[PDB]
Structure 1
Amino acid sequence: TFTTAIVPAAGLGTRFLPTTKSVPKELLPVVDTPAIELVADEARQAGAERLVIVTSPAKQSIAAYFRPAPELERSLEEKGKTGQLAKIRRAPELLEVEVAIQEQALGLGHAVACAEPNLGPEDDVVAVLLPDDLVLPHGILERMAKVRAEHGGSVLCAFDIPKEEISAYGVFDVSDTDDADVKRVHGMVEKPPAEQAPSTFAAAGRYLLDRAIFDALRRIEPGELQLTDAVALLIQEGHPVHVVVHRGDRHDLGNPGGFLRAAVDFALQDPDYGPELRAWLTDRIARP
């Protein structure tokens, strides 16, 4: 399977201004843990050995997150904070992390293209994880790998969303396969009204891209490089593209509202917070 996962992390996160003026969006805590760690863990569990984070020069603190912190570790160990200590050791031990620095945030297609110098002869396919999407539980990339193994080519991800709730998404035009959760991708429609939606399958931020994507990204017309256009070009030129339908849960960290739903969902499942938080929420929602 794939060994390299790419995380595009170039965008400011304008919905979290003013905080994202100074703090990388991908380091914001979900309860106590940054999304960059959550997606790094997902990638590792799907068998990534390497993570290529694409970011801006201002967001290099992301890199330092994945390096050991000797003094802090020694301090926690001396206080007997074994739980906090394990929690800080987790991210640095997940995988080999590299940062591809992109001077200007010019969109997702450009961010993926800037990862190409970090790839090697073994990278026939790369995983891509968008860090604003949490796809739960872990394992969507493993299902996508099964599809790559059977059909070759590239693999996308979809959420199954009713046509009347889908108009914020890219929506796949598809044909059936022998697996109910796997479709062949014919195209994508951006933000269709319900009556024009070609399917209930909404583009989700997980990919297994064949190396052919980099050539496709070089040959698309800018106007910012759209990854969808590069995928559309591959489909034109006969490259197989399938999509796996995620059936489980998801969170959207793209704006504070979605971010808070994720943090609350996770905090309610944690005994350090859950019971007291549940009691507080019960009363709080009964008043303005």
Structure 2
Amino acid sequence: MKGIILSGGSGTRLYPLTKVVSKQLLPVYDKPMVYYPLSVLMLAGIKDILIISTPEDTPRFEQLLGGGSELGISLSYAVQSSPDGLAQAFIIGEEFIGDDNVALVLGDNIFYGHGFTELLQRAANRKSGATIFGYNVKDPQRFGVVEFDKVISIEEKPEEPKSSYAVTGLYFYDNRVVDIAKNITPSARGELEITDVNKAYLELGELHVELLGRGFAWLDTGTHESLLQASQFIETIEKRQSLKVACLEEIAYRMGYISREQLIKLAEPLMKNEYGQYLMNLAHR
């Protein structure tokens, strides 16, 4: 299955941090934000990935991540010249997607939980239908909202919201999504809305929802406060539980994409902080 990271634009809410730095390059503890959604595609077993960003950001992401060969994956880049809605991902990515299934993750979304990888790996391995991920939030109505029983409805930012399950920024689709995205009508405000893509699979009876309740984290990166809360969570998990979240090199290595010697070479030009040292130890034993 292929994957797309869509970043994302902005963000103004984070000014002045985002005056001269892309939101998705801001730290979340010790890693650029975009490491987090990338790691989620990687943990899903997705290895062919298109990163879509603004014309201004695209070169910076490419500088950060290159073509992915150090991680044993393949990264490509495209531009979204105007922010016309998330579903543009599948028009912009039409050629890259080809005949394949494809997952889309938003560049500012952070997921974490034991048993998450299982859910990702299961969604990636579904050859038919769409899988979305629901999260209990206090603020339903500034998200897409999913009502269930098994899915009964989905609405984008419903002023009367029929549940407190936000539809998170992670979606897995079969190849029909390309044609679906083409047949969406733009919303008031000329956006091609992902929630219409999800309504199309609902109508087919083939929208599957994974509800991440107990044991799962989905972190808000939208404000100075929530961005620091995210960094503290990551540091706290990492320090108290001796584990790394979205350490791309560790994941490439655990998934069998890269060898012991290749991991050591990733730690050789960087043998210093607690990042590199996690890696070079990992590589021994």
Q: Is TM (by shorter chain) over 0.5? A: yes
SS of the residue 1:261 aligns to: helix
Aligned-residue RMSD, C-alpha: 2.8
User: Which residue is equivalent to 2:219?
Assistant: 251
Determine whether 1:202 maps to 2:166.
yes
If the length of structure 1 is used for normalisation, what is the TM-score? 0.71
In structure 2, distance between residues paired with 1:139 and 1:106: 34
Report if aligned partners of 1:54, 1:112 keep a CA contact under 8 Å in 2: no
In structure 1, distance between residues paired with 2:238 and 2:119: 28
Determine whether 1:226 maps to 2:193.
yes
SS of the residue 2:18 aligns to: helix
Shift, 1:20, TM fit: 2.4
In structure 1, distance between residues paired with 2:225 and 2:41: 25
Question: Residues 23, 211 of structure 1: CA spacing in aligned structure 2 closer, same or farther, 3 A cutoff?
Answer: same
User: Which residue is equivalent to 1:170?
Assistant: 144
Determine whether 1:109 maps to 2:87.
yes
In structure 1, distance between residues paired with 2:69 and 2:228: 23
User: Which residue is equivalent to 1:65?
Assistant: 64
Report if aligned partners of 2:177, 2:197 keep a CA contact under 8 Å in 1: yes
Question: Residues 149, 239 of structure 1: CA spacing in aligned structure 2 closer, same or farther, 3 A cutoff?
Answer: farther
Determine whether 1:241 maps to 2:217.
no
Query: Greater Rg, structure 1 or structure 2?
Result: 1
User: Which residue is equivalent to 2:46?
Assistant: 48
Name the stretch that deviates more: 30-39 or 261-270.
261-270
Name the stretch that deviates more: 139-148 or 58-67.
139-148
In structure 2, distance between residues paired with 1:36 and 1:62: 9
Report if aligned partners of 1:141, 1:208 keep a CA contact under 8 Å in 2: no
In structure 2, distance between residues paired with 1:252 and 1:269: 16
User: Which residue is equivalent to 1:5?
Assistant: 3
User: Which residue is equivalent to 2:112?
Assistant: 136
Shift, 1:189, TM fit: 2.7
In structure 1, distance between residues paired with 2:223 and 2:69: 24
Name the stretch that deviates more: 112-121 or 263-272.
263-272
User: Which residue is equivalent to 1:93?
Assistant: 71
User: Which residue is equivalent to 1:263?
Assistant: 231
**What is the identity percentage for the equivalent residue pairs of Structure 1 and Structure 2?**
26
1:182-236 superposed Cα distances (whole Å, 9 cap, x missing partner):
x3x332133346xx54334221111101221121111112131111112213433
Determine whether 1:213 maps to 2:213.
no
Shift, 1:38, TM fit: 1.9
Structure 1 gap segments, 5+ residues each: 69-89, 176-182, 273-288
1:47-67 superposed Cα distances (whole Å, 9 cap, x missing partner):
011121111111121011113
Match of 1:189 among 152, 155, 158: 155
User: Which residue is equivalent to 1:152?
Assistant: 128
Amino acid at match of 1:109: A
Shift, 1:138, TM fit: 6.6
Amino acid at match of 2:171: Y
Structure 2 gap segments, 5+ residues each: 241-285
If the length of structure 2 is used for normalisation, what is the TM-score? 0.72
Amino acid at match of 1:232: K
Question: Residues 145, 154 of structure 1: CA spacing in aligned structure 2 closer, same or farther, 3 A cutoff?
Answer: farther
In structure 2, distance between residues paired with 1:92 and 1:257: 34
Question: Residues 263, 147 of structure 1: CA spacing in aligned structure 2 closer, same or farther, 3 A cutoff?
Answer: closer
Q: 1:18-57 residue pairs with structure 2 within 5 A?
A: 18-57=16-55
SS of the residue 2:191 aligns to: coil
In structure 2, distance between residues paired with 1:28 and 1:11: 13
Count of matched residue pairs: 234
SS of the residue 2:179 aligns to: helix
User: Which residue is equivalent to 1:282?
Assistant: none
In structure 2, distance between residues paired with 1:53 and 1:147: 20
Shift, 1:142, TM fit: 4.0
Amino acid at match of 1:39: P
